[PDB]
Design a protein around this ligand. Structure first.
Ligand SMILES: O=P(O)(O)C(O)(Cn1ccnc1)P(=O)(O)O
Ligand SMILES: O=P(O)(O)C(O)(Cn1ccnc1)P(=O)(O)O
Ligand SMILES: [Mg+2]
Ligand SMILES: [Mg+2]
Ligand SMILES: [Mg+2]
Ligand SMILES: [Mg+2]
Ligand SMILES: [Mg+2]
Ligand SMILES: [Mg+2]
Lengths: 342, 342
């Protein structure tokens, strides 16, 4: 049933590509650039969970009266959903380079491809351009047009501030254990993930449904930002303890000296002895040293600490839904929470 | 006199930075990210010619009635001028990485700096965010607000398509002499430079003056796109024949197998013998091979061919100003042409 709503949305990706590559119908000079764009979209916006873009569609259907859910209104809903998918695609293409990653979504990272390399920096910028190209082609004559443009622009800046904080707390070749606090961690994830992966899709659907009130968005934000914090903590857990055949990506957080939730929890439980083991093995490419950190996390029963956090966080998010979902259907936040909590 | 209009605009960069880094006044958690933003702006938006942003200010003063040139209207003019400077800054930070450059504006490229590296990909994205942050803070309640947003978004996409075409015609380790044509060359530069360096600043001033007519913009475009084509040809000439103490940047076009104006002209004049010399020495990091290409360009009197092109192009642009400047003051295009033709 949830895979059926997924399949309908996925079947629309062909048209999304068709309208984004129809610029060569009038301008054949930019043909090769248009062909390369199709290649970038096909490689980086397909093979994922589609949970971010699908949230836009699900939330639209739950917030708009079926009497106002015509064919054009629905096409605008899946198109904006696919704009959210492009925002993630563009930020992940860049993230894989800056995180020096190997795989994403079951295949090697776009930049690791022979013949691509650092040309992927411009490929990511092209993916970002498509958001605003689609918003113009489908929402240009809608009352929420500017609200959508500003929400995608603001969400991008918040992610970028978050990415800056992520990279400044993780300098390659520097011991940053002192700076790996819970307070720092909470600030990083609020900006790098919680805004663009959780607030952006529901807020886009809210603007498309005519719900533009600062109070309604502020109350939605209270739930979704906390949901985003958990989602990033889960991403950090699975970076080391997940199955790359399931996650589709190889972990790099220990090697990259990252301010992971795991290392924050490690520093809160580590003896003076265990603090030095971490200090000497964290942030290095050596497989021997990465293994020593994974062993220390397992000694401090961090996979168990995570299972307890997930239970406590689900109860917390649920408490916030009861407090702030109104006047929106609780199903809006409940639907996404069920899909996020495994 | 032209340096006086420059100095006033430059003196406003301090406030541009102050308003872009006042986000930590309310949110001290993102402080370190805000400090890094200030560092990126200070390093990459200062030390240039400021000719792109200054064109916005000059064109505003020439198109708006002095009776309507109040303090607020003028602040919006220098702020939009500085938005054009941020668009160039963000595209050049990325370009230096993809072109594997050494210096820009007298100093080493932002990415070549110890401790920066590929973190500069996110630094470039932050520079792009500031355009829309400034447009919101100063033009949000203006009738041209959406026109500006759409003009900067469209200009970015056109540059990106251009950058794609630039990089696809220049694959590292591949002989692309066959593809280095005048027709290809004209398409690359139209998109990578002519739109964002020439059309964007005058069009921004036109929208701010209330001139939004498609016919007026189409006629402006006819002049400015041709002006941009010459500016890129000049940039390609100076890549090899310019003085890095003047240009502030080291040439990489031969090493990068680029579709330069020089190599297009070389292929039009080269004997079968000279074609093979180029084939064996172009696109390689070897200083010996780069030198062999420079020698062949000098043998075919390409610095003389350039001097003839500059004369013919200036007469051409001047012919187009007489044909399409009306109903705008000819000074608008004449001012920029004098500043571009050396
Ligand atoms: O762990 P990251 O923050 O780097 C990641 O979650 C991506 N990302 C980037 C910003 N927010 C999330 P991914 O593990 O997918 O590589
Ligand atoms: O020669 P490029 O096109 O790479 C350059 O002109 C920059 N640029 C990039 C797009 N348009 C212009 P620069 O020589 O400054 O490195
Ligand atoms: Mg990553
Ligand atoms: Mg990352
Ligand atoms: Mg991760
Ligand atoms: Mg360059
Ligand atoms: Mg370049
Ligand atoms: Mg150049």
């Amino acid at each position: 049933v949830y895979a059926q709503e997924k399949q309908d949305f996925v079947q629309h990706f062909s048209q999304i590509v068709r309208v984004l590559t129809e610029d060569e119908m009038g301008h054949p000079e930019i043909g090769d650039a248009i062909a390369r764009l199709k290649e970038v979209l096909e490689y980086n916006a397909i093979g994922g969970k589609y949970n971010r873009g699908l949230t836009v569609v699900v939330a639209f259907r739950e917030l708009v009266e079926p009497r106002k859910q015509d064919a054009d209104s629905l096409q605008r809903a899946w198109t904006v959903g696919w704009c959210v998918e492009l925002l993630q695609a563009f930020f992940l293409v860049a993230d894989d380079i800056m995180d020096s990653s190997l795989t994403r979504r079951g295949q090697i990272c776009w930049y690791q491809k022979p013949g691509v390399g650092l040309d992927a920096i411009n490929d990511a910028n092209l993916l970002e351009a498509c958001i605003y190209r689609l918003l113009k082609l489908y929402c240009r004559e809608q009352p929420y047009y500017l609200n959508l443009i500003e929400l995608f622009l603001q969400s991008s800046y918040q992610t970028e501030i978050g990415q800056t904080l992520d990279l400044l707390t993780a300098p390659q070749g520097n011991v940053d254990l002192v700076r790996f606090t819970e307070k720092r961690y909470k600030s990083i994830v609020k900006y790098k993930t919680a805004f663009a992966s959780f607030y952006l899709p529901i807020a886009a659907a809210m603007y498309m449904a005519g719900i533009d009130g600062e109070k309604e968005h502020a109350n939605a934000k209270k739930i979704l930002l906390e949901m985003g914090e958990f989602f990033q903590i889960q991403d950090d857990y699975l970076d080391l303890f997940g199955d790359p055949s399931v996650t589709g990506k190889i972990g790099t957080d220990i090697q990259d000296n990252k301010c992971s939730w795991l290392v924050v929890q490690c520093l809160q439980r580590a003896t003076p002895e265990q603090y030095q083991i971490l200090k000497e093995n964290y942030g290095q490419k050596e497989a021997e040293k990465v293994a020593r950190v994974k062993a220390l996390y397992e000694e401090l029963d961090l996979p168990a600490v995570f299972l307890q956090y997930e239970e406590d966080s689900y109860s917390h998010i649920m408490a916030l839904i009861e407090q702030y979902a109104a006047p929106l259907p609780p199903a809006v936040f409940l639907g996404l929470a069920r899909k996020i909590y495994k």
